[PDB]
Paper text:
Malonyl-coenzyme A decarboxylase (MCD) is found from bacteria to humans, has important roles in regulating fatty acid metabolism and food intake, and is an attractive target for drug discovery. The MCD monomer contains an N-terminal helical domain involved in oligomerization and a C-terminal catalytic domain. Unexpectedly, the MCD catalytic domain is structurally homologous to those of the GCN5-related N-acetyltransferase superfamily, especially the curacin A polyketide synthase catalytic module, with a conserved His-Ser/Thr dyad important for catalysis. The catalytic domain of MCD contains a central eight-stranded, mostly antiparallel β sheet (β1–β8) that is surrounded by at least 11 α helices (α1–α11).
Numbering used by the authors:
A (entry chain A), B (entry chain A), C (entry chain A), D (entry chain A): 35 to 144, 148 to 444
The structure:
């Protein structure tokens, strides 16, 4: 109620240098709310805290005959929603940034007017969280526990059991892990990656995870394996930077361990099984031999081990199907169907090889029938590959992958 | 030459996450330049890196009939100069922020098209250097020397001799000093203030500075005296925050030393002598008794000590003249004539008293014939005072000051 | 083999400033060993690296007629075992201190000649780990995990389950914990204590531990409860300092939370059941009514809950028996029978009250049939109490405890 | 007065864990004193706080027939002065170590009974300041100023003018400097060295110091030059470790700049002129041609420049005289006459070459008529050289030095 006239004052408080209290209070009265209040705030925010159309037209006015840089400025200014300043001003409150981030979070949960009140959140987050203001910190058994526990929490890909499991892939000098931290938040990371230093390229995530694995000297390691990336902040969805993390990490590895020559990933590739469902539909208009269709009716039974021959016959038609998925199949906007593909590829990586039944975990079995792939991050091939994809519609794939071309 | 097509690529390098090299190089090829190059860069920046008018009209187009929030967005977007992204993207270069700050500096040194290429620098600096991202650090004999030396350098008001002088007002627990630091720069402060903890309110800066002064127990101190504020970053001219520093400091003093009851300033007030020149001009249209005019002909002689009576007779007509200066005289835009007045007053302070011949230093003798004033920062009186001034045209002055009203 | 002539060189390497390598190597060749080697080292250490009796007699010689301070020096010197320098010199090896500490550990595991080679370890540890060189660090959910895990490991009294349990008594601002750290070791603490801030004095450890407990505002806390102290370093057995930790902690609590008025402990008191066994033996020569003896035959059945009346009748004769244990029963050297008693009492604490069935845990049930006591750390009463005990044979007990005097 | 019975209590306060207050007070009542009090403390310290001869004889008693390790212990114990514990116990006082160090300082300023009360100070300082507990910290323009200023203060060899001078040899990446710090003191270093990274070996300190010098890329540096070592703590006189500092530094340079191949020193060598005085005395019994004696009468005139021929003729007989000084001349205890020689040589360095008129400064002109030498720290030649000297009486000198053998 009053917590909606407060803001009005946050914008009027010119060179006061006191609004911090305003910002503060507004942020705490927000701390407490209900799904029917937190919603009536994100509305009257867009319903009243937008661009003052009066001054804007007055501007499009002057512009009709004044197309000189000074006008485009007055225009660009009037065009700015008032809820943008409000945010900047709200940022002054103690830890106000984090509070504003969790706020854009409660928004993203929930009309089309909101899509507008969000773009502003994004516009500010895209600068406040400019990668130039983020420091890459190494995460290991040493880093404080209250933040380490958040790692267990945010592990999206290969969910981390409990603390002994966490230690397992964080303690050995066999392993290593890095996260991005912003000075304001600082106790909670933005994104992180887990790496495995090894003497080869894994095919099964199981290899990399089993404690019964054999540890190798950190420096006797020839290749680095990014086996799991994770975004921790949800209210930063869109303000992407994992795209950096890799580029950075690979380089800091170069320095510290010049013995590393390869930089791969043991990625997941979900929404592949989803695809398969679309293909099995005769209405797919997708080519399938009555014999093929008759072999994929095997996926509908959650059993692969039984009759190794069973999986064997599945493998025979899955990989090429996948290769096909990857190398060609695009979405209606013409992009690689898989979400993590658009990632590694959008970062100039290369589809190195397919790993049939790499996971075997329940999630991946349902996400994409156990499949897993390795993406490669070659030194020179990166801006070139990023081009093949970007504007053309090409996917950087190795001959081993292309090979399965038609089968 | 090529260092002007590079940028063009910095904007095309979408989800590449490699432009850092672009940013870098562009920033170093900039490192080296000439006043005839550094100028041909700040031009072709505004001459080509502005808003693409084609898409902007296409937008004012759709807006003529679409006044729904989603349109104002597309408008506000098209209205944005391309040199804005360029900056954000340039920020990625190692220490890119500092490099971009020293850049806006080389701009400010130097047509009206530049006034437009600067507003953008400002728009980004006003968010990047949002006070929420600045930490108040205490500065004393402990803080590292490479940064301490910058303090000697940037002391604007009461210029600091050499290191022994610096130590003098930095070493005693009699003294204290705070600065604002931004995480990126971090080794060079943005603004700082020097404080003197005491048992009274000074009138002469000389009192506060002489080593022969008598030191008092830090906690036996009753009042805090801000005797000198200074902005270190020139390329941040306009992105004001000293206005905060005080508000903060006073509070951290409250905590650490609850014995402090007053919070004053031993300020300078320049451009007062400048004013006096304007008044002595008969064409001023300003009231002056032939007797007054005949007493101010004493200022033209750089000697005050000689014949204490001389200064005495000057004092008699200067203070009230000053009181007048302060309490009423406004500029053509209707604001307090003095620059540091617009500061302390714009921060809800109060003109407590005038100090005739407080300085005696060459700068202040020429800046405002040795005068100096004390501004007060009372607890409750601050948002009220800030209002008296803000929208009305009133100046918070104590009865002791008002007293000189008419004389 | 050669790893026993190396040392010989460590003592000959005067102003070489190179023996670090000697120290190093000797410490690594030690790293690897066997119970039949690590023992043949701790022998030839005392069997050859002791005081050179030749020079010592030559000294007791000169002393027979020279009793001037300069002689007592030459004497005190000759009297010094060579294995003392060896240790000092061994300390130079990288992390050599920690390595020498784990070494005194392998000694303590294992004739009477060793009791001599140990005193030297002690003489050096008592100075190297002089409390003046130890810093009290606060331990909580923030402190790094690799060290936090050691806390779970070394919890001697109320063994800590797993990480969720650890968090439980480390996370709330309801709780708090401090440890002593020496600069060399630094990643592993020496001793630590767990405290519970509350509004009363606990009787059952169960109260303090159950998560279902009710948390109170840290500052709304009236009393502090030391519920568990633990020494982490075994090779520092004897170089006692937990005796400090308390004295320190209580004081830092005073500062940070002036609301704390009491400082108690919910201590264990083991070897009490052990005592009881000694009393039930008719040969004890200890007074016991045929009726008493007939009620303590109830302890031999591991069931207390069953027939609350059972425990009730046990309680009736246990507390006074205990009060007796405490207030009078001394050992053959005339000291309080309980080991943790000699602790809190030797630190001028006061036996405040007895807690029948405070623990109920298997260890305490066997250690001292569930009993638990609260010791008090009153401000003035401490050096006085420490005297009552020290040289006299008195135990600081409250009237509530004394009360059970004879029953 | 009472401040001499306090200590008596510091020794009686067994497991009190409260004596810190005793230690404290005793240390402050000491803080204040007079040369006639501070002396009456260092006396009644040795006059009453020494070994209790009663128990000592009781020990030499048991030893007459008991020569088993357990006896030598009781002996070594009784032989220990009580003022030794007192110190250990005094160390508990806040910053008690530093306070005890400045104390041994006031002692060293001032009978032969004191020589005994000091050995104990030394015995404890030699362990407390065991090199294993000292960390080598790099000192440069970054390190805090309150400690940097102490560097200006303690520069013994080439006295450092003021802060601009200090900066001069501390700021360039041309230069570098390291100091040893003990955790307790920590704000004041123990010993430090100044190094110059270069492309050759200097002969004149003047080369290394002049700002007009030409700076070279830190890594384009081929050799490291230790041009000045300094001990800061006087109360640690005897607890030598500069002997380490070099050994350490050279190694950390190896790592950071593998381009460094040589490690020399541009040392001073005082008490050389002193020697010369001894030789010019006919009573020296030292060979001197009437022609020699007649050329050294030139030193008595403080002018070298005048008639370059003058210095030229001095040079001709000085270097060989020096070579002689160095290579042979020993003291009555048979050691190298120069004090800094006994240093670099005692650290296995090599006399590489002599620098006639290297200094020219007033101190060196009087210390040793401008002469200066370079000592070499070759990799393998160090423990060998340290042996040549140690037990034999040989000095590691290069053929260039030996060459001047007889002239
Ligand atoms: Cl904050
Ligand atoms: Cl980084
Ligand atoms: Cl950076
Ligand atoms: Cl702050
Ligand atoms: Cl170490
Ligand atoms: Cl402490
Ligand atoms: Cl301390
Ligand atoms: Cl070190
Ligand atoms: Ni913007
Ligand atoms: Ni000793």
């Amino acid at each position: 109620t009053d917590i909606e006239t407060l803001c009005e004052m946050l914008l009027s408080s010119r060179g006061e240098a006191s609004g911090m209290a305003i910002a503060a209070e507004i942020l705490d009265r927000w701390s407490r709310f209900n799904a029917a209040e937190a919603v009536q705030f994100l509305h009257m925010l867009s319903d009243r805290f937008g661009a003052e159309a009066a001054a804007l037209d007055k501007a499009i006015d002057a512009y009709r005959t004044d197309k000189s840089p000074m006008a485009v400025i007055a225009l660009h200014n009037a065009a700015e929603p008032r809820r943008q300043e409000l945010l900047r001003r709200l940022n002054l409150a103690p830890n106000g940034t984090q509070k504003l981030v969790r706020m854009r979070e409660r928004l993203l949960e929930t009309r089309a007017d909101l899509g507008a009140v969000d773009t502003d959140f994004a516009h500010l987050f895209s600068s406040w969280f400019n990668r130039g203001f983020l420091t890459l910190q190494p995460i290991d058994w040493t880093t404080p526990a209250h933040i380490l526990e958040k790692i267990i929490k945010y592990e999206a890909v290969h969910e981390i059991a409990g603390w002994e499991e966490l230690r397992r892939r964080l303690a050995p000098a066999d392993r290593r892990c890095f996260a991005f931290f912003h000075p304001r938040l600082r106790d909670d990371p933005l994104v992180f990656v887990e790496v495995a230093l090894t003497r080869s390229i894994p095919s099964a995530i199981a290899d990399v995870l089993d404690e019964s694995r054999d540890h190798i000297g950190a420096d006797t390691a020839t290749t680095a394996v990014f086996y799991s990336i994770s975004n921790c902040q949800d209210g930063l969805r869109g303000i992407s930077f994992g795209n950096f993390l890799i580029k950075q990490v690979v380089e800091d590895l170069r320095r510290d361990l010049p013995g590393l020559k390869e930089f791969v990933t043991l990625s997941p590739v979900p929404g592949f099984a989803r695809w398969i469902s679309k293909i099995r539909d005769p209405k797919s208009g997708f080519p399938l031999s009555p014999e093929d269709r008759n072999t994929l009716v095997l996926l509908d039974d959650p059993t692969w081990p039984e009759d190794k021959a069973r999986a064997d016959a599945v493998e025979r038609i899955l990989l090429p199907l996948a290769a096909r998925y990857f190398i060609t199949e695009r979405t209606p906007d013409n992009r690689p169907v898989d979400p993590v593909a658009r990632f590694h590829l959008g970062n100039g990586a290369r589809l190195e090889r397919l790993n049939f039944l790499g996971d075997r975990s329940v999630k991946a079995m349902r996400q994409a029938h156990g499949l897993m792939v390795n993406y490669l991050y070659k030194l020179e091939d990166i801006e070139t590959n990023h081009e093949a994809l970007a504007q053309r519609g090409e996917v950087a794939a190795s001959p081993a992958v292309k090979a399965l071309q038609g089968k």
